Amino acid sequence: NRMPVAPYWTSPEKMEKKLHAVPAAKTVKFKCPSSGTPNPTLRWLKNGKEFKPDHRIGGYKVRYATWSIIMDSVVPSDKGNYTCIVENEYGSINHTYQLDVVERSPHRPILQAGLPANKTVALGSNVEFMCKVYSDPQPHIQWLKHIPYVQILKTAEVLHLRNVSFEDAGEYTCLAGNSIGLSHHSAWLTVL
Amino acid sequence: NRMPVAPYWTSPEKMEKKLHAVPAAKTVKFKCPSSGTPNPTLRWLKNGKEFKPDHRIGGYKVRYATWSIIMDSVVPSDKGNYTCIVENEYGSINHTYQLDVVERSPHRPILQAGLPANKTVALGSNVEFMCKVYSDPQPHIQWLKHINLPYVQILEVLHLRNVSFEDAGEYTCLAGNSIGLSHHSAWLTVL
Amino acid sequence: YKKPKLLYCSNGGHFLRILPDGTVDGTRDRSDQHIQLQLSAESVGEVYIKSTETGQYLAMDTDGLLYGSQTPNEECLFLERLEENHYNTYISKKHAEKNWFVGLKKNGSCKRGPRTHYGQKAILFLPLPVS
Amino acid sequence: YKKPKLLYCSNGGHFLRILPDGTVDGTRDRSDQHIQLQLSAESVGEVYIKSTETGQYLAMDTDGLLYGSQTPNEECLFLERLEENHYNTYISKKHAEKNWFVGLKKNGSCKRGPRTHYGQKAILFLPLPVS
Numbered sequence A: 001n002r003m004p005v006a007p008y009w010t011s012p013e014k015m016e017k018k019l020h021a022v023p024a025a026k027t028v029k030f031k032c033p034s035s036g037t038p039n040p041t042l043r044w045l046k047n048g049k050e051f052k053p054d055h056r057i058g059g060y061k062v063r064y065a066t067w068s069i070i071m072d073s074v075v076p077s078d079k080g081n082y083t084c085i086v087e088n089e090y091g092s093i094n095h096t097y098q099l100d101v102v103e104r105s106p107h108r109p110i111l112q113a114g115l116p117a118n119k120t121v122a123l124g125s126n127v128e129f130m131c132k133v134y135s136d137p138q139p140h141i142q143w144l145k146h147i148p149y150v151q152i153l154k155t156a157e158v159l160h161l162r163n164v165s166f167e168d169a170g171e172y173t174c175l176a177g178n179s180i181g182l183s184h185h186s187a188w189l190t191v192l
Numbered sequence B: 001n002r003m004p005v006a007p008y009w010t011s012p013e014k015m016e017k018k019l020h021a022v023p024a025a026k027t028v029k030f031k032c033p034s035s036g037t038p039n040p041t042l043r044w045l046k047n048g049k050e051f052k053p054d055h056r057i058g059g060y061k062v063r064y065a066t067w068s069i070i071m072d073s074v075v076p077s078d079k080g081n082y083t084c085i086v087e088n089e090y091g092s093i094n095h096t097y098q099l100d101v102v103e104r105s106p107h108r109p110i111l112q113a114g115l116p117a118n119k120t121v122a123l124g125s126n127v128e129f130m131c132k133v134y135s136d137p138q139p140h141i142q143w144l145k146h147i148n149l150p151y152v153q154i155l156e157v158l159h160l161r162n163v164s165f166e167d168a169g170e171y172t173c174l175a176g177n178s179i180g181l182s183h184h185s186a187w188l189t190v191l
Numbered sequence C, D: 001y002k003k004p005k006l007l008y009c010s011n012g013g014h015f016l017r018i019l020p021d022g023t024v025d026g027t028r029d030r031s032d033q034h035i036q037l038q039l040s041a042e043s044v045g046e047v048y049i050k051s052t053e054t055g056q057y058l059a060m061d062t063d064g065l066l067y068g069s070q071t072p073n074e075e076c077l078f079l080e081r082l083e084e085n086h087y088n089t090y091i092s093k094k095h096a097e098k099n100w101f102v103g104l105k106k107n108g109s110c111k112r113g114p115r116t117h118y119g120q121k122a123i124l125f126l127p128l129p130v131s
Helices: A012-016 B012-016
Strands: A005-009 A019-023 A028-031 A034-037 A041-046 A061-063 A068-071 A080-088 A091-102 A119-121 A127-130 A140-146 A150-155 A158-161 A170-177 A182-191 B005-009 B019-023 B028-031 B034-037 B041-046 B061-063 B068-071 B080-088 B091-102 B119-121 B127-130 B140-146 B152-154 B157-160 B169-176 B181-190 C005-009 C014-018 C024-027 C037-043 C046-051 C057-060 C066-069 C078-082 C088-092 C125-129 D005-009 D014-018 D024-027 D037-043 D046-051 D057-060 D066-069 D078-082 D088-092 D125-129
Touching: A005 A080, A005 A091, A019 A028, A019 D125, A034 A080, A091 D125, A119 A127, A127 A182, A140 D037, B005 B080, B005 B091, B019 B028, B019 C125, B034 B080, B091 C125, B119 B127, B127 B181, B140 C037, C005 C037, C014 C046, C024 C066, C088 C125, D005 D037, D014 D046, D024 D066, D088 D125
Parallel strands: A019 A091, A119 A182, B019 B091, B119 B181
Antiparallel strands: A005 A034, A028 A068, A041 A080, A061 A068, A080 A091, A127 A158, A140 A150, A140 A170, A170 A182, B005 B034, B028 B068, B041 B080, B061 B068, B080 B091, B127 B157, B140 B152, B140 B169, B169 B181, C005 C014, C005 C125, C014 C024, C037 C046, C046 C057, C046 C078, C057 C066, C078 C088, D005 D014, D005 D125, D014 D024, D037 D046, D046 D057, D046 D078, D057 D066, D078 D088
16 A cells, blocks of 8 residues: 555664663563554564563553563563564564573571581681671671670681680681661570 | 511401492591501502592591591582502402482472462463472472462462453462471462 | 472381371481372461372371371361471361371381370471382 | 672773773773773772772872773772662762762763763663683
8 A cells, every 4th residue: 555664673772771670570562663664563582582472470561552562571481682673575673682580589688597507616726617697788798706795706607716714615607787677596506 | 577477357257338328518437447467557548549638628537546537527520439458568458338428408499489480371271380499308289279378279380271351360389398498489470 | 389298207217108908107208209298278377298199198096196098188287387396297087186296106107196295306307209 | 709800881882992192081892902801899889899800999189080090099988889770889088078980981982081971871880700
């Protein structure tokens, strides 16, 4: 009916941002604004293969008017390349977006249970206490000796006591804290 | 000085237990009770290579009297094959133990933040809410519809078929274990 | 927690096994096709434990004897508790009052529930990944 | 949290970059050798952010301009907050009162701290693994 026109980008700019990194649970939308006559088709692929809505929990909508696909609540399994393919009887163009998802953990730091563990050593023995911390936001770790009164020992995984003596005996604590809260585990050092 | 005797096991039985699986932080001890004359030597290997005490944090002791090696506070990096090697001028015997470590997490279940997430849909649309749970002990998961605490209606994903206006409202994913329980909610809007 | 595990017993290094004939015991072989278990919570703290291979549930008879069950029932539910010593213990839900543990002996042979004590190594279990 | 990361900015998809000459900007190339950062806490909530490649610290001048610093100082410490929207924002510890954010513009160019607002996409960052 009208003058043929191969499909072309209507907002190439917006498409410059290739990688979409999103925190888990956010709704992700991809657009490939396009035009062409006769009016072109919109299809979407995930890592090369066809992408049907049953391919993921939640499925996904495609607003043909806004040349976009909308995926609610993205999760790691969703990570991958998404390609839109626009085409008509006179041409086909395409574009690919990378999608990365990161699960955010807004809790105070978590210490590995059991660590540090009690220890019994002989006078003169060197000693090491371990502490395993997990924290999305940057954790600040400190080791504390009990004298509850305390004596900061080290300030930012292991507390190292050189040529230990009886005075070295006692309770020790590994403290880790972030913007949300702080956590700690203690252990007792016995000396013989 | 005395009649030669190649090194031999003094408690072969105890050695039957090849794999030592231990929860992280426990002290692990390995023994190879042995005898032989002249009195034999005790050395230990980790995955074939020599095992020096600086090879790991904490180090490790070897009670030559009890033919054993003692490693305090074991952690994942410690996992591997440990071989004792006993030998004298007349022979050498050996044995290898597997060591596995598991970090235990004694806390109530943990739900992935953001899940489930709010959703708005059209009348008739089917819907699915997600919930990601982590729990060392077996977690018990329940989905709750809301109707000094609120009334709920017991119902990874919650699936609502041909939704209607009545389906609109707040939903909760509850998970609990012997230590405690946790939950996250989300609101479903319908148009 | 959805993946199948192995319930390693610290008493002799045996992996809890549920043989296709209903025989419950232990073995030191990880390639054995009947040590993979799928734990599930019927309610908070109470679990089922079934072989992935045969679909048999671990159960305890009124004698205090472990056995494989073709279908789940009261004798299949166990109370799962992560102990302070960081090990797991499974107490018969049905025979709780008496404190009947799921345990195993030095040789991996079924250990009669009425002979299991709180301080035994036989009732201490550790969850492990198949590989 | 000990591993180096990339601070991806949601405003244009640019990875926070600290060029060896002190120039702070963004890029859309993950193979770029200067996007890998090592964050550290001097104290709870306050962090250093330094290029693993050059060892330069991200810092903000009294103008509100981001730049690489050969050595750490008061202008290098930033307040790290995980926002409700699940993104991270980094506020100049020294110019906190004014609410001076570390941000980036639609084209990845350094965004003057005094032009950053709480509701901007420019100050929203996401931690990502190198690969």
